[PDB]
Design an enzyme around this catalytic site. Structure first.
Site, short mmCIF file in Angstrom:
data_model
loop_
_atom_site.label_atom_id
_atom_site.label_comp_id
_atom_site.label_asym_id
_atom_site.label_seq_id
_atom_site.Cartn_x
_atom_site.Cartn_y
_atom_site.Cartn_z
N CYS A 61 46.71 4.29 -6.44
CA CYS A 61 47.53 5.50 -6.57
C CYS A 61 47.86 5.89 -8.02
O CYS A 61 47.91 7.07 -8.35
CB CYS A 61 48.80 5.42 -5.71
SG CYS A 61 49.91 4.05 -6.08
N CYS A 171 50.76 -1.41 34.48
CA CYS A 171 49.95 -0.49 33.72
C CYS A 171 50.06 1.00 34.09
O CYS A 171 49.88 1.85 33.22
CB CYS A 171 48.49 -0.94 33.74
SG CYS A 171 47.40 0.00 32.68
N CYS A 179 36.00 -8.88 39.33
CA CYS A 179 35.08 -7.83 38.87
C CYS A 179 35.72 -6.67 38.11
O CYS A 179 35.01 -5.83 37.54
CB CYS A 179 34.24 -7.28 40.04
SG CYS A 179 35.16 -6.48 41.39
N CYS A 189 32.61 -8.83 46.17
CA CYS A 189 32.48 -8.29 44.81
C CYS A 189 31.05 -7.90 44.41
O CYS A 189 30.83 -6.81 43.88
CB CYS A 189 33.07 -9.26 43.78
SG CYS A 189 34.88 -9.25 43.62
N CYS A 220 41.24 15.86 56.82
CA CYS A 220 41.24 15.28 58.14
C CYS A 220 39.85 15.54 58.64
O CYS A 220 39.22 16.52 58.24
CB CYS A 220 42.27 15.96 59.03
SG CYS A 220 42.17 15.43 60.74
N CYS A 225 37.83 24.70 64.84
CA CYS A 225 37.27 25.89 64.22
C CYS A 225 38.17 27.09 64.47
O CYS A 225 38.84 27.15 65.50
CB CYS A 225 35.85 26.14 64.76
SG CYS A 225 35.39 27.87 65.00
N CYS A 230 35.39 30.91 69.84
CA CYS A 230 35.41 29.46 70.08
C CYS A 230 36.54 28.78 69.31
O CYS A 230 36.53 28.74 68.08
CB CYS A 230 34.06 28.82 69.75
SG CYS A 230 34.06 27.63 68.38
N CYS A 238 29.97 13.82 62.12
CA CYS A 238 28.80 13.98 62.99
C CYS A 238 28.60 15.38 63.60
O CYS A 238 27.59 15.63 64.26
CB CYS A 238 28.73 12.88 64.07
SG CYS A 238 30.14 12.73 65.18
ZN ZN Z 1 47.08 -2.03 32.00
ZN ZN Z 2 32.01 11.77 64.59
ZN ZN Z 3 49.19 2.21 -5.01
ZN ZN Z 4 36.19 -7.64 42.93
ZN ZN Z 5 33.54 27.63 66.25
#
Ligand code: ZN
Ligand code: ZN
Ligand code: ZN
Ligand code: ZN
Ligand code: ZN
Ligand code: ZN
Length: 395
Positions: A61, A171, A179, A189, A220, A225, A230, A238
């Site tokens: 400095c 945390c 793991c 794991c 859900c 529908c 309907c 499915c």
């Molecule tokens: Zn942590």
């Molecule tokens: Zn189903």
């Molecule tokens: Zn210094």
């Molecule tokens: Zn694990």
């Molecule tokens: Zn429908």
């Protein structure tokens, strides 16, 4: 399961000791012994076996501070306090930051002992960037010490033995100690990691009776529908009807040059992926849950969400468990305990998303409670029977 959490401070303390212990008759400056230990991965024996073997202005400095800001390194170079502060601080920043810091003249290259790099740096974030950097080897080489996963968290969990259980870091992140992923309870794991290496899912699907289209809001999988034509209901996964679902005979959670692999794969991912998207939606449900609480009396309602949320988790992990499972006689049972749980979940999910405000006020306690008690009790049978499972090797 015995486990403890330590601050970057405490781990540094512990390392300091482990160094000091090793300082005779070697008698080296604490920081050189660190490099040396860190170099041997902290096997202290391997270092030892190898040890008996063999191996008045300020020029930065320019202001004049009279003598008292002036601490120097062993090489006789003497620079002022604030000046060091800047030198260290900017040197511990990218890039090329090592496990050490050489004296600033760079002519001599003689390193600056750790303690003084603890004394002289000021704003403590950086002092943390260092404590991490010099500690990192000490921690990674020990099997009872693991850093906490979160990016901005410098704490470390220390366990009695490395068992793959959940650990909470204040945390407040929770993780598998083995793991370091999120807590997986049914699945093993190694399998999880493999599954992760893989991972679409169609936010838009069409109602099977009227071929109308529905994008999914929630979360859900019991859908009704919206039509005059309907009003019918069906499962999202499915596209088949509710509610033969979750009765013994229809099971939507079970699967029948081989393309079959890339076909059946799509079965279990589609499921795990969709229980995720389902868990995502289930989470914005918390902010909504402060409202309708209107004290003990009125918080069972965070639980419902806690429990609904929990179950979506365990489900994803049960598909991961199931994909890598080779079929056998417990497969057919666990595949059932799953279906019970998947149903208990779609029922409760669907009650908090839909059927509840369309219900009266008196009633909703009686219902929500039973709904998530059964949901939770299902989820435990699933887990306890795979655990007792892991014990006989049956999978
Ligand atoms: Zn942590
Ligand atoms: Zn189903
Ligand atoms: Zn210094
Ligand atoms: Zn694990
Ligand atoms: Zn429908
Ligand atoms: Zn020097």
């Amino acid at each position: 399961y015995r486990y403890e959490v330590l601050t970057a401070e405490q781990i540094l303390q512990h390392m300091v000791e482990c160094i000091r212990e090793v300082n005779e008759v070697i008698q080296n400056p604490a920081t050189i012994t660190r490099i040396l230990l860190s170099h041997f991965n902290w096997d202290k024996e391997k270092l030892m076996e190898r040890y008996f073997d063999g191996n008045m202005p300020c020029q930065i400095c320019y202001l004049n501070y009279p003598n008292s800001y002036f601490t120097g390194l062993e090489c006789g170079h003497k620079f002022c306090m604030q000046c060091w502060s800047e030198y260290l601080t900017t040197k511990i920043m990218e890039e090329g930051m090592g496990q050490t810091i050489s004296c600033p003249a760079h002519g001599c290259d003689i390193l600056v002992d750790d303690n003084t790099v603890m004394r002289l740096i000021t704003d403590s974030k950086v002092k943390l960037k260092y404590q991490h950097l010099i500690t990192n080897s000490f921690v990674e080489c020990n099997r009872l010490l693991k850093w906490c996963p979160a990016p901005d968290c410098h704490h470390v969990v220390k366990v009695q033995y490395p068992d793959a259980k959940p650990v909470r870091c204040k945390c407040g992140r929770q993780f598998c100690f083995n793991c370091g992923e999120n807590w997986h309870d049914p699945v093993k794991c190694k399998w999880l990691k493999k599954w992760i290496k893989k991972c679409i899912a169609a936010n838009t699907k069409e109602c099977p009776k009227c071929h109308v289209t529905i994008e999914k809001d929630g979360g859900c999988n019991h859908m009704v529908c919206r039509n005059q034509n309907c009003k019918a209901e069906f499962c999202w996964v499915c596209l088949g009807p509710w509610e033969p679902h979750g009765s013994a005979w229809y099971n939507c959670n079970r699967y029948n040059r081989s393309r079959a692999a890339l076909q059946r794969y799509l079965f279990y991912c589609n499921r795990y992926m969709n229980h995720m998207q389902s868990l995502r939606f289930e989470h914005k449900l918390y902010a909504q849950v402060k409202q309708k609480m209107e004290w003990i009396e009125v918080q069972f309602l965070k639980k419902a969400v806690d429990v609904l949320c929990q179950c979506r988790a365990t489900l994803m992990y049960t598909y991961v468990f199931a994909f890598y499972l080779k079929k056998n006689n417990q497969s057919i049972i666990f595949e059932n305990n799953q279906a019970d749980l998947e149903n208990a979940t779609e029922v409760l999910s669907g009650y908090l998303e839909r059927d509840i405000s369309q219900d009266s006020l008196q009633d909703i306690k009686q219902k929500v409670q039973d709904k998530y008690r059964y949901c939770e009790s299902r989820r435990r049978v699933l887990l306890q029977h795979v655990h007792e499972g892991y014990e006989k090797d049956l999978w």
